[PDB]
Amino acid sequence: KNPKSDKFKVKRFHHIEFWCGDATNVARRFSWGLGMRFSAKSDLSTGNMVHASYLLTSGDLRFLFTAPYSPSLSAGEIKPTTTASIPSFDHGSCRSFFSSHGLGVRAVAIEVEDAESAFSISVANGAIPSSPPIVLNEAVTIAEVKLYGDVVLRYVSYKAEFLPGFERVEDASSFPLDYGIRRLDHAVGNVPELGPALTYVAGFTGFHQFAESGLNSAVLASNDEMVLLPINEPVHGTKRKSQIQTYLEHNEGAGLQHLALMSEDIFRTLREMRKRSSIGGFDFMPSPPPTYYQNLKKRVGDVLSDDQIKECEELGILVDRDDQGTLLQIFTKPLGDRPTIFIEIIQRVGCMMYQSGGCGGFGKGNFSELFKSIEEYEK
Amino acid sequence: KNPKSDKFKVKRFHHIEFWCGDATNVARRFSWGLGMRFSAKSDLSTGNMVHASYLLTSGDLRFLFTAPYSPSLSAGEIKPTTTASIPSFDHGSCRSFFSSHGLGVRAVAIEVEDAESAFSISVANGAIPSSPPIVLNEAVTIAEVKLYGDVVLRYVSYKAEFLPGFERVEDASSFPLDYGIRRLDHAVGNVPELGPALTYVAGFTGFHQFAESGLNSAVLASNDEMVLLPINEPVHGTKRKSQIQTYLEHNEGAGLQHLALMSEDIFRTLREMRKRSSIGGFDFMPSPPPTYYQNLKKRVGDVLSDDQIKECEELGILVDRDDQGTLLQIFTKPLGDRPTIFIEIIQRVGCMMYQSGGCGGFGKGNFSELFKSIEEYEK
Ligand SMILES: Cc1nn(C)c(O)c1C(=O)c1ccc2c(c1C)n(C(C)C)c(=O)n2C
Numbered sequence: 208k209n210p211k212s213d214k215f216k217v218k219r220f221h222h223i224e225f226w227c228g229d230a231t232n233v234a235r236r237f238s239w240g241l242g243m244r245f246s247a248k249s250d251l252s253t254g255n256m257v258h259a260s261y262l263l264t265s266g267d268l269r270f271l272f273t274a275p276y277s278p279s280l281s282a283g284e285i286k287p288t289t290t291a292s293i294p295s296f297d298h299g300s301c302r303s304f305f306s307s308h309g310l311g312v313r314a315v316a317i318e319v320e321d322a323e324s325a326f327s328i329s330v331a332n333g334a335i336p337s338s339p340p341i342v343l344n345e346a347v348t349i350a351e352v353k354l355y356g357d358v359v360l361r362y363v364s365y366k367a368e369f370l371p372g373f374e375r376v377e378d379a380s381s382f383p384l385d386y387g388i389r390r391l392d393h394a395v396g397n398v399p400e401l402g403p404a405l406t407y408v409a410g411f412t413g414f415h416q417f418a419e420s421g422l423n424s425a426v427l428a429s430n431d432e433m434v435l436l437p438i439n440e441p442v443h444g445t446k447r448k449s450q451i452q453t454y455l456e457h458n459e460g461a462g463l464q465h466l467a468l469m470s471e472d473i474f475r476t477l478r479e480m481r482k483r484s485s486i487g488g489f490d491f492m493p494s495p496p497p498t499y500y501q502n503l504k505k506r507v508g509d510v511l512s513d514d515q516i517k518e519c520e521e522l523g524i525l526v527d528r529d530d531q532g533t534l535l536q537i538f539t540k541p542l543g544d545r546p547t548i549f550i551e552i553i554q555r556v557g558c559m560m561y562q563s564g565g566c567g568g569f570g571k572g573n574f575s576e577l578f579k580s581i582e583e584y585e586k
Numbered sequence: 587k588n589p590k591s592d593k594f595k596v597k598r599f600h601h602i603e604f605w606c607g608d609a610t611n612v613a614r615r616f617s618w619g620l621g622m623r624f625s626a627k628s629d630l631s632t633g634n635m636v637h638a639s640y641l642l643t644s645g646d647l648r649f650l651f652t653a654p655y656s657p658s659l660s661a662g663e664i665k666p667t668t669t670a671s672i673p674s675f676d677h678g679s680c681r682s683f684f685s686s687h688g689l690g691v692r693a694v695a696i697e698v699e700d701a702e703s704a705f706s707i708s709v710a711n712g713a714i715p716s717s718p719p720i721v722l723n724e725a726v727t728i729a730e731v732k733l734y735g736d737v738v739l740r741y742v743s744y745k746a747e748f749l750p751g752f753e754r755v756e757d758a759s760s761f762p763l764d765y766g767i768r769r770l771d772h773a774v775g776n777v778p779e780l781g782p783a784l785t786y787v788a789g790f791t792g793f794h795q796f797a798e799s800g801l802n803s804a805v806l807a808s809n810d811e812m813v814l815l816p817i818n819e820p821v822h823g824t825k826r827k828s829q830i831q832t833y834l835e836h837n838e839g840a841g842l843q844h845l846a847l848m849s850e851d852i853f854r855t856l857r858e859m860r861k862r863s864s865i866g867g868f869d870f871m872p873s874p875p876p877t878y879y880q881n882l883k884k885r886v887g888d889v890l891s892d893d894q895i896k897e898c899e900e901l902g903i904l905v906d907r908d909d910q911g912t913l914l915q916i917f918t919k920p921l922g923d924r925p926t927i928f929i930e931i932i933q934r935v936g937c938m939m940y941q942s943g944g945c946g947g948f949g950k951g952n953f954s955e956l957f958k959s960i961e962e963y964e965k
């Protein structure tokens with residue numbers, strides 16, 4: 208059941224912004240590890256005396272990495288005279304965020320028809336304002352409201368080329384890496400209490416709820432279910448400590464837990480990423496035992512051939528099924544020093560009309576199947 | 587003239603420590619860009635609840651990357667019960683350093699015969715103490731005094747395997763990269779006033795002075811001239827703004843300007859580094875004009891063949907000569923967001939007895955020769 212209750216017109220995920228201590232080193236690491244190209248910059252060389260911002264792209268996926276300069280470089284500026292390309296940026300907020308949480312996502316940005324209307328409707332419906340709507344070069348409008356913890360939901364709308372004040376990256380520094388990642392599928396938050404978090408976000412967006420292990424969760428979705436925002440809470444008192452609780456402890460509270468990146472060829476993406484794990488890229492969680500891939504024949508034997516199942520086993524890929532589609536997924540180890548944010552690589556098969564959002568679910572069935580596999584491999 | 591006036595026995599450079607916001611991403615970027623292997627760690631997985639520290643090695647070169655965890659993880663600890671592997675570490679100092687200077691060198695570490703005696707003699711001779719001598723597992727002693735700005739000179743001595751509490755890195759995560767870098771040749775500081783900086787450092791070490799462009803500089807050296815610590819000050823009032831002054835502005839004061847890394851085969855190192863510049867590694871300063879390499883025939887035609895001169899031209903390598911040896915060198919663009927710290931790759935030819943320290947100088951003649959080359963190429 209999809210009541211299509213969005214309180215304003217939402218299009219697609221637009222970008223994810225990481226707040227960093229040094230944007231250069233994080234962006235270069237991510238570029239090589241994920242196969243994303245350097246496509247735009249806003250920094251000292253573009254006249255920005257406030258923050259260094261670097262944009263990586265793969266397909267429609269946009270990752271922005273931002274760090275503050277010394278405040279002394281811009282001490283004479285005021286907001287009317289700022290050289291910052293992102294007017295919501297604040298030195299103190301960024302330093303406070305990074306000292307509190309470490310490397311992590313500050314903004315989940317969605318493209319909307321009208322960022323000023325989106326902001327006004329959200330705040331009229333309970334959203335806590337973070338940055339009021341600001342029109343950039345009479346071309347783009349940006350506004351921000353609080354999502355959870357110190358993460359903001361950023362609205363971007365275009366009258367008619369990332370943002371004004373960003374420059375295209377020169378082709379010499381713009382090596383055309385591509386491991387097959389094409390877009391953001393979903394962005395997941397961890398909170399101490401799921402109920403109040405869901406009520407708050409669904410309250411100001413009109414997003415609807417989309418259709419033992421240490422977590423309870425729920426998924427909020429836009430009208431066409433292309434913007435997907437799951438939220439998790441921990442389950443206490445279990446034998447094994449909840450990984451959601453571990454997140455909250457090491458992150459100093461609520462924040463973004465994982466980004467799921469859709470691949471157009473998850474086999475190629477994982478081959479390319481795994482080749483680079485020990486040479487500057489990303490590590491992956493330990494692979495399931497062979498009993499898992501043996502049991503996959505009975506579960507997904509009508510969707511994947513035996514060869515493709517064998518290809519899943521080489522790469523450590525997980526498979527899950529809903530009533531409408533099938534999910535291939537795998538998880539990285541945490542992206543930085545703290546056991547907090549990580550990345551999921553996903554590919555979905557089924558639900559063709561284009562492919563509808565959330566085809567195959569989010570893999571919650573893999574908890575029990577991994578468990579059964581571990582017990583079976585112990586035998 | 588070498589008066590051999592060291593006030594305590596100094597051996598060699600031991601390691602360089604960077605203070606980071608996220609040590610994982612910086613260390614992974616540096617590993618791929620410079621061809622250094624992950625060799626040791628001290629972090630949550632080794633019981634360290636205080637800081638994450640990762641050691642990269644290439645030959646005798648040791649780069650350490652350290653970042654703080656949330657103070658909440660260690661809030662119940664006191665110094666007698668600390669889980670930190672580097673007892674001088676302090677959360678507040680590290681956050682203050684990074685917010686002030688950005689990514690940069692906190693410690694220049696030299697191995698000495700007795701770190702406690704080195705500390706006591708230094709402080710008795712004017713050194714400002716930073717961290718008193720601490721014996722680690724009855725095996726290693728570490729102590730720190732201020733060098734310039736917020737950079738410390740760290741003394742390490744071994745009774746008889748980086749530091750106690752560091753664990754060797756498992757071979758799966760330890761990919762054997764190697765682009766030919768073998769050791770630290772020199773470490774250079776930028777200060778506002780050279781005189782007082784030299785007097786201070788030479789005062790407490792007994793290091794001696796080793797044998798138009800925007801800088802004045804001088805080099806301090808240990809007895810065998812294997813530890814080399816140049817210091818620069820800006821020259822004001824020139825047409826072009828001093829790059830030393832630019833450093834001081836963007837760094838918020840004095841600090842380490844560049845690390846010069848000796849290669850056993852600078853041609854291989856530069857081929858390997860340049861292949862990776864646009865895929866996560868390091869960029870290099872713009873190459874000199876072809877008139878430079880034409881003029882090199884008359885300057886170094888007796889040391890390098892025409893083919894090897896042509897190889898220098900492909901890779902953008904600079905060449906300088908002293909009275910005793912020849913210097914091949916090249917400089918990276920800044921390592922992070924700010925126009926502050928960069929790296930020099932160096933190889934020295936001549937002065938064989940082993941090779942004596944500082945063979946060929948430090949390349950100051952390349953200022954005039956680059957200038958002449960630029961005017962000649964304008965023609
Ligand atoms: C669950 C869940 N709910 N929603 C809305 C999602 O997007 C998810 C997941 O992406 C997911 C699915 C299966 C997992 C898993 C995750 C994070 N992890 C990590 C290590 C915790 C596992 O070990 N397994 C087996």
Ligand SMILES: Cc1nn(C)c(O)c1C(=O)c1ccc2c(c1C)n(C(C)C)c(=O)n2C
Binds near residue numbers: 803804805816871917
């Ligand atoms: C000088 C100097 N003194 N000492 C003690 C050193 O180690 C040096 C250098 O390493 C050096 C030599 C030549 C240079 C240079 C540097 C840093 N730069 C940078 C961009 C400023 C140039 O453009 N040229 C031509």
Ligand SMILES: [Co+2]
Binds near residue numbers: 393395465467551569
């Ligand atoms: Co997921």
Ligand SMILES: [Co+2]
Binds near residue numbers: 772930948
């Ligand atoms: Co040098």
